[model samples]
Target: MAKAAAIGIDLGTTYSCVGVFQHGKVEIIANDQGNRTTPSYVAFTDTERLIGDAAKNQVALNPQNTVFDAKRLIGRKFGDPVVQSDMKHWPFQVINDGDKPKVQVSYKGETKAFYPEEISSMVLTKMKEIAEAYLGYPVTNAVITVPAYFNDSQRQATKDAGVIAGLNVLRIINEPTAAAIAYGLDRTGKGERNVLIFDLGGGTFDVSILTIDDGIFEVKATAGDTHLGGEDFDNRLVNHFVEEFKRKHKKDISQNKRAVRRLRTACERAKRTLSSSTQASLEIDSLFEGIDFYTSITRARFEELCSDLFRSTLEPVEKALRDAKLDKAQIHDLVLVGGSTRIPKVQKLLQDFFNGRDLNKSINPDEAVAYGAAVQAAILIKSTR
Candidate 1:
């Protein structure tokens, strides 16, 4: 039998997924918990600690100690505009004590400090372990995907994370371009399509319009927000809870550090539930004795929220089309990327805005980028597994 295969990873802001091409087929590796993607979160428990899913599931109970959006923290400075603006309301305590970015977690009554690379490496190392376990072989070589708009420092930081995680990263491919690669893999005819890739992940929003010539994925234009996505949506929901509770009870719960942290965690989960169904509810108590508030958000209400956010997303979409010198009607297809696009309103808005051109949501919006990375991994890395 041939050696197993090199692995590809989508190190997303909210979740991480790994895949490989083995025996001429694509296979997505599942985490130990039987999940295709692990939550991109880390928690420091009184015991040791946990990464990915274990950390994410317990965050509502231990919000202050768990770090979920380390991707936003990486390649950022302590006093940078984005970091400073978000620090005021974010749940985690970001302590930039060194030359580089770091997080301080109080675990087991001890203050443990860690660099951003170290925290991300823990997640990557777990991915490597899963590949090895699934293949029954040693796994090392990899191809990692990144946002097209990530700058030099950001790309370098990702490479550093891979090194600390113990993998020989063969190459860093742009996420949008990688998606195009996967899309064109099996095509054998000559054709061209003016397509737009709208990627809205946990921490970023990107619009890349490309012209495909045979197997060539040429990016005509691109635009994005490095700090926009699902996190912001959840933050809106959290702030709603805070302001309403204050107005009703005349007590400012936002001032309580622990209370705010716990509520933010619940807010994120409730937002996830609202994505699939018409109504979603979350209960918060113990902050006020006999004070349990049940919050329900209908799909219509969520769409209203999207209308507010959709404006932010539109600038990039229109900008990409203009940069590419193409009109909305001329665009052949609109491809959806990122878990955030799963919200039905995003799909509807794209359809209406594109002059009734049917938006394509056929791809697994959650795993498309990761699967694309897997295909690139096979071409970029040489491995004995």
Candidate 2:
């Protein structure tokens, strides 16, 4: 029997996933919306608070009250350069509370201010609830993964958020390292191996090289951009179509936050479609001034638009390899993590970078980090007693 039930959480910027060890395997818990992964959005209405899919559904209608991308705010000062830059994109009000940044939302018929930790805790609390509902028991112990580049204060803020959600937080691990644990489970068949992990998620990117000996994952090097990933790709797609809308329909939606949100939703769907097909179509009903917006983009055009951004991802891979003092050919196993890695252009670039190596994508890109966390949680819980 399992000694204790402890789960792992990938507390991601755009989406979160929870998993637990069951029957000697990692079983990811699905949210009430029947999704294996949940959006990390928290929205507040005068009557009640909404989270996950429900919070995201009304984002266009309740732009200012909906809080997403709370990861960038945690442990950051209001004067932070990135925070100042990000505020322009977010419709929600971010005001200065002392030196720290605080988000303003309408809740309970009042304009209330919330700390970044408070916003993050709501998402964590939602993930906790999902796990508990699925397990049919109380879940207090957990292991959560964060970006490898986060500083001490950033991780402390994450731990505080977990504490606020009534979790013990058994371990705080790096995202790629957790992925290594999940994918490295079969390493016993090969003994010792050097693996390079490329993880590009919704809001961040990380490439880490590790040497795994049996159950040990020793990190050799890691590098990434905390503010870069699929979201930037979404932004590029959104802007291209926004400009196209103006050129074709002569409508400028620069000031329409609601329409921008709608366009983003449409663009996000198209982005996913282009990942599997040569082209994708986008259509938004009543995008602006009672007119519909329609556009289709070929995969080649999308690649050209984000060429620089896609190339930026390769810089870190080069940096990581140099830091590890290992040649690219020395990377025995290349594990791909994160939803962004599934992009054909991204795969082709990396494949070409490593001399046409086939990426190991056997694991679920989204849940691998959470699954690795569950394995560690089970290890810690079992070793404790």
Candidate 3:
């Protein structure tokens, strides 16, 4: 008797990943490019459509054709105020189809309309390919992780994306729960332990309180802001740089889509660099109007620019604690998940909130959800057998 191919997927806002349980451990499956996480981006070129890294890399060149953050728009209506507000930030065309919003882009010399689910399906399809390549067999059954605050519509949209990608979704687990499983808290065999999961990814932020006891996991409360995360942090830096560029050269490059896109990519790099260094330098040759952009930013300055945004995440943390009717002292461990959790300001603020208690860093933040999803996949496989 052999086990069926089962995998778990973390369909994240900024990045997506796949994993499988095998040989008594959860193994993350890297895509063809040998990267464990794939950027959740899509682009249309004159020759063909692209997904993942290829699409993300071309965002500067094809700002009008590259689409990112479809997760923010999925399962929303055309008249939704959030959708309307988001459209202003994107260079690509977003138009209404009946009540739903559809993306319009030029591909292969023709205009094409794409549903948000359709774009998401491409990312899922790529993950499916990555799994098949690693396992040397087809994988049909999978468990996917989503935010705890995701509503019925958003969850359904995610499952629909899996179906469109040719997968039979076994279950939809909350991102925080998956992260808990990856940490093996459920198997700790200890008495009830209160754990707080703080997830700040590329595009969304969430905080959840859970109680784990003797192989059981319970979600006590959860709260979040759907529009906050690394992307927002990057945007803050981008705006600062944009304003500085304008002040120095007397030119506003914000209206220039390509220039903005390039600046966005640079700011993203600077954000990552500042995570490790006290200062980061930004230099872009011919960033706009054939002028070079140069600037040096300190970690303190970056944090200052984003201090309010960092503090904003704390309101949800307080709300979650209030919803659980538990004081901060009752929380035993704080588990940090998601890429944005790597930011120094984010980590410091959360630590300060917890009275200088260190955050749990036993698991890799980026792949924690996928690993936990894989663990759930294994449990499902066992039950079915």
Q: Positional deviation of 357 in candidate 3, in angstroms?
A: 1.2
In Å, residue 260's CA in model 2 sits off its true spot by: 3.2
Inter-residue clash pairs, candidate 1: 138-385
* Stronger candidate by lDDT (1 vs 2): 2
Q: Write the residue-wise lDDT of candidate 1 on 110-209 in tens digits.
A: 9888877788888899888888888888788888888776788878888899999998888888888777666653254587777788998877788998
Stretches off by above 4 angstroms in model 1 are: 1-4, 23-25, 58-65, 73-99, 102-114, 185-188, 239-270, 281-287, 381-385
Q: Is candidate 1 or candidate 3 better by lDDT?
A: 3
Per-residue lDDT over 288-333 for candidate 3, one digit per residue giving the tens place of the 0 to 100 score = 8799988889999999999999999999999999999999999987
Total clashing residue pairs per candidate? 1, 0, 0
Error of 1 at 194 (Å): 3.1
Error of 3 at 163 (Å): 1.8
Cα miss at 381, model 3 (Å)? 1.6
lDDT of each: 0.79, 0.88, 0.89
Q: What would you estimate as the lDDT of candidate 1? A: 0.79
Each candidate structure's TM-score, on Cα atoms with residue i matched to residue i, is 0.82, 0.89, 0.89
Inter-residue clash pairs, candidate 2: none
Candidate 2 local lDDT, 1-385, one digit each (tens): 2237888999999899999988878999999989999999999997999999999898878888999999999989899998999999899999998999999989978999988989999999999999999988888899988877778888999999999999999988988778878876435665767889898988888898888777677788988887788888989998898899899888889789888878887887898899899999987888899988877999999999889999899999999999999998888889898898889999999999999998888778988899889998888888876
RMSD (CA, Å), each prediction: 3.7, 2.7, 2.7
